[PDB]
Amino acid sequence: GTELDYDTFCFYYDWYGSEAIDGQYRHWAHAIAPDPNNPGTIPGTQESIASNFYPQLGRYSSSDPNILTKHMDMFVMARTGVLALTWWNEQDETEAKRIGLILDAADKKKIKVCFHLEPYPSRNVQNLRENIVKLITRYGNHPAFYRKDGKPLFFIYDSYLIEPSEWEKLLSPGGSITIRNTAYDALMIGLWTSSPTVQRPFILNAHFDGFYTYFAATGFTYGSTPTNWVSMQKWAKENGKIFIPSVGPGYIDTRIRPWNGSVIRTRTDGQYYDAMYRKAIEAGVSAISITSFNEWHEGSQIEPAVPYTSSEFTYLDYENREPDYYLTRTAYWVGKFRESK
Ligand SMILES: OC[C@H]1O[C@H](O[C@H]2[C@@H](O)[C@H](O)[C@@H](CO)O[C@@H]2O)[C@@H](O)[C@@H](O)[C@@H]1O
Numbered sequence: 001g002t003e004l005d006y007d008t009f010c011f012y013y014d015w016y017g018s019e020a021i022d023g024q025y026r027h028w029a030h031a032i033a034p035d036p037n038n039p040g041t042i043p044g045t046q047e048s049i050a051s052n053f054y055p056q057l058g059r060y061s062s063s064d065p066n067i068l069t070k071h072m073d074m075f076v077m078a079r080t081g082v083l084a085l086t087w088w089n090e091q092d093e094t095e096a097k098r099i100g101l102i103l104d105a106a107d108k109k110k111i112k113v114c115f116h117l118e119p120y121p122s123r124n125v126q127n128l129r130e131n132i133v134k135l136i137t138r139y140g141n142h143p144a145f146y147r148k149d150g151k152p153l154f155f156i157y158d159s160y161l162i163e164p165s166e167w168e169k170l171l172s173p174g175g176s177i178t179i180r181n182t183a184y185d186a187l188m189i190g191l192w193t194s195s196p197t198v199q200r201p202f203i204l205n206a207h208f209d210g211f212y213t214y215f216a217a218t219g220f221t222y223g224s225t226p227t228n229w230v231s232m233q234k235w236a237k238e239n240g241k242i243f244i245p246s247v248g249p250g251y252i253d254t255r256i257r258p259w260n261g262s263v264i265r266t267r268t269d270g271q272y273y274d275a276m277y278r279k280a281i282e283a284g285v286s287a288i289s290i291t292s293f294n295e296w297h298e299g300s301q302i303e304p305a306v307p308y309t310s311s312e313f314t315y316l317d318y319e320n321r322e323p324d325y326y327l328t329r330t331a332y333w334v335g336k337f338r339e340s341k
């Protein structure tokens, strides 16, 4: 009852910086988003960071090998065997260095790493293919690189921004630039957002291998409404698709999106997380994703947080629970998920 689960994916963000390592407390400092219907910036000082919560590890660097060790030990505590790494195609030496550091640290703990392909500028199926080839070439032989039944796995965020007719070229076995039957074949997991009438043909026509839902906030989309998960799984099974619902402990992003309060989901001392995780397991899925390890801007993190009140902000915290509660509660749910597999 302590081993890692390799069908449990935890979304991980490597974009945090410190002045010492990165030259700026990157992401702890963050622009405040204008209201879609100034706004200024959060300066990323000790007192004022771009989160409604406050990390136990402080304003850390994602490139600090000592932080990475600590994070891998947290994954072990949570029993989450796969780190699903945000990937922004920065094409810079700092990105390349950090990915290697994360793979190296993960391997010491038998954690695996897969990539979460983000909506980088001009993303399209051709440069996606080239980037999948690059990632598999660079990292595919690393011992921590994830495979499921012989295949890499990628999550594709906001996949609906690319038309199914383009996806088909990459993901159908007959597609013009197919990855199927090549050295670069992979399980491609697209984002299910809206109603079945839209999403079912999208997924089929795009030739995705499966789908995930991402959002930690229940009801934000059809896909992130857990009462839909039984029927989504039924459809997945009938159509040979892998459904990987995303569960999270809460949501709050109002430091960076002050206009977005309607998306707040309160943690209620863990009861929100328990409810969402239970629904995923009851749906009878093969794999679960966790939003998130450390999306601190969106308040979905399971990473330890501490009480903190500064002269600039009174942070939220884990209340009646201890800082590592969400790690240990994840481990509880991983056990229940395994019991179901
Ligand atoms: O606008 C706030 C909203 O922004 C982000 O989500 C956007 C997009 O990535 C999603 O696919 C669609 C889903 O309908 O919504 C937005 O356009 C997220 O940061 C989200 O959590 C946030 O509420």
Ligand SMILES: OC[C@H]1C[C@@H]2N[C@@H]2[C@@H](O[C@H]2O[C@H](CO)[C@@H](O)[C@H](O)[C@H]2O)[C@@H]1O
Binding pocket: 086, 116, 118, 119, 157, 295, 297, 298
């Ligand atoms: O990993 C998928 C998304 C997770 C999270 N909603 C953000 C998206 O990133 C945008 O918003 C971040 C702040 O929450 C911002 O730092 C980043 O630059 C944005 O691209 C992720 O795409």
